[PDB]
Design a protein around this nucleic acid. Structure first.
Ligand SMILES: [Mg+2]
Ligand SMILES: [Mg+2]
Ligand SMILES: [Mg+2]
Ligand SMILES: [Mg+2]
Ligand SMILES: [Mg+2]
Ligand SMILES: [Mg+2]
Ligand SMILES: [Mg+2]
Ligand SMILES: [Mg+2]
Ligand SMILES: [Mg+2]
Ligand SMILES: [Zn+2]
Lengths: 23, 192, 136, 69, 37
RNA sequence: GCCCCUAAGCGUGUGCUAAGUGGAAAAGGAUGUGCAGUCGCGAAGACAACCAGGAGGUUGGCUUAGAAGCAGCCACCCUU
């Protein structure tokens, strides 16, 4: 489902620098 | 047969190592070493376009006259590092040669001719090892299969060499094997 | 299907899909070949599929070499099993394919039919691949 | 004028030709017999000389697997 | 009309065109008429 | 981060994108457009269009009910 995908993709923001807790 | 040297501008490298080399390739230059019987390795950059064009025109074993700080040096392309994916030349080994010097070189064997109609020609050696003069290196040796029937086995000893050219590879090497064309039944068994 | 006659170790760690192929990066038997551009485990079933596609297209009068042999076992646990209780039994045989590796080679008199045949094979493979020649 | 292939058949003495033109040689036909076919086909050929007309007939012999010598 | 991700000219009279942002094959043979989608 | 919500640039110079792409996705399909590089043909008239010729042995052998350039298999010659 889209929830997982959207949550992980937000790590690719400028502020996260490509990483985020729980992927 | 006599080949004329192809002129390439070359400059001595200021810096060596992977950082310098990667920058040179990014600016369109190929790093090279020049080494010789004179035992005096020089570190050079060549223009990538010009060097590639020479190799396209005259093959892997082209004879070059290098212009190093205004001094002309005769050199032969000894070896090329080609990236498996990008197909770009990463590096060149150049051997200094004086005219009339014997050099051992590997040349490309081309196959020409219409085999008998039920025949498939299989080439087992891309290359043969040859002794020749620096300027007499043939850019390609051609073997003709125009008539041979199934079962024939052209060997390295059976290939025409120009005058001056000597065979260093042993004569028993198969260059061309001619076989009767596989049936559909044999294609289905092969590799099953 | 290509299977090894025997293996010393029937349960193996997965082959590592890292690095560019250092060996088998040129066409050595035929005049045309398929060169991998991506990492994959190519199974024996994919190899069979691809080889038969090439055979059907050329019909006869050509030779196909398979430069890759699937001798690496991959295991599988029985279906609907919880985690644990030992490693699964071997199920698939794969070749560890790296970019630059030449997978198939073909000799054929006609270039147009040869290229089409190799294209038919590429559509059977899990990876992206290009046709390469013996020439520079 | 009769078919050149059938003239080759009657000149070679065989009732059916090869199913594999190259892999077989049903029979052999002298250039003299080929020239006679050329002369009797002269009303039906583009050629100027009988030599060229015979070469035309020899092309038919090739396509049906008859040796010409 | 064929509607498929892949659209290919099926015969030498098939012409590939782009129309309203879709790749299409138009042909005189109405079987070969196809649209990307 | 700097159009307004919302502190600070509807900043300056040179380009690219027409998809609201930017502001999710594969194998694969594709005369989208830009930049760079190999190679072909062309003022001895090329590429497109239009006028005319495109043929004779011959329905090339084999297979078949049949197979005449155009199920299939082998060969793919010669002449004006
Ligand atoms: Mg899912
Ligand atoms: Mg190795
Ligand atoms: Mg404000
Ligand atoms: Mg800004
Ligand atoms: Mg403004
Ligand atoms: Mg602005
Ligand atoms: Mg602007
Ligand atoms: Mg969007
Ligand atoms: Mg996408
Ligand atoms: Zn059509």
């Amino acid at each position: 489902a889209k929830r997982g995908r959207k949550k992980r993709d937000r790590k690719h923001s400028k502020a996260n620098h490509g990483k985020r807790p729980n992927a | 047969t006599a080949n004329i040297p192809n002129k390439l501008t070359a400059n001595v490298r200021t810096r060596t190592g992977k950082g310098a080399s990667r920058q040179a390739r990014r600016d369109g230059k190929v790093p090279a070493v020049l080494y010789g019987h004179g035992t005096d390795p020089q570190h050079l950059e060549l223009n990538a376009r010009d060097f590639a064009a020479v190799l396209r025109s005259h093959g892997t074993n082209a004879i070059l006259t290098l212009d190093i700080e205004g001094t002309e040096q005769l050199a032969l392309t000894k070896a090329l590092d080609v990236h498996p994916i990008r197909r770009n030349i990463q590096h060149a080994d150049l051997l200094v040669v004086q005219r009339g010097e014997k050099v051992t070189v590997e040349v490309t064997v081309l196959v020409e001719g219409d085999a008998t109609p039920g025949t498939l020609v299989t080439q087992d050696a891309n290359t043969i090892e040859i002794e020749a003069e620096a300027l007499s290196i043939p850019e390609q040796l051609t073997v003709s299969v125009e008539g041979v029937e199934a079962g024939t086995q052209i060997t390295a000893g059976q290939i025409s060499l120009p005058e001056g050219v000597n065979l260093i590879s042993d004569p028993e090497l198969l260059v061309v094997n001619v076989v009767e064309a596989p049936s559909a039944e044999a294609l289905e068994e092969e590799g099953a | 299907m290509l299977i090894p006659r025997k293996v010393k170790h029937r349960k193996q760690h997965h082959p590592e899909q890292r690095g560019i192929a250092s060996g088998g990066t040129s066409v050595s038997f035929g005049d045309y070949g398929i060169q991998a551009l991506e990492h994959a485990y190519i199974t024996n079933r994919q190899i069979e599929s691809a080889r038969i596609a090439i055979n059907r297209h050329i019909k006869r009068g050509g030779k196909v070499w398979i430069n890759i042999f699937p001798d690496r076992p991959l295991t599988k646990k029985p279906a609907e099993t919880r985690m644990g209780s030992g490693k699964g039994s071997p199920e698939w045989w794969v070749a560890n394919v790296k970019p630059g590796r030449v997978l198939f080679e073909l000799s054929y008199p006609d270039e147009k039919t040869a290229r089409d045949a190799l294209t038919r094979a590429i559509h059977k493979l899990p990876i992206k691949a290009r046709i390469v020649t013996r020439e520079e | 004028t009769p078919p050149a292939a059938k003239l080759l058949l009657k000149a070679a003495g065989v009732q059916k030709g090869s199913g594999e033109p190259h892999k077989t040689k049903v029979a052999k036909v002298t250039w003299d017999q080929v020239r006679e076919i050329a002369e009797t086909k002269k009303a039906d050929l583009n050629a100027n000389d009988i030599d060229a007309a015979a070469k035309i007939i020899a092309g038919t012999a090739r396509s049906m697997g008859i040796t010409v010598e | 009309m064929k509607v498929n991700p892949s659209v290919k000219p099926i015969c030498d009279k098939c012409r590939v065109i782009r129309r309203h942002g879709r790749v299409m094959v138009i042909c005189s043979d109405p079987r070969h008429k196809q649209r990307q989608g």
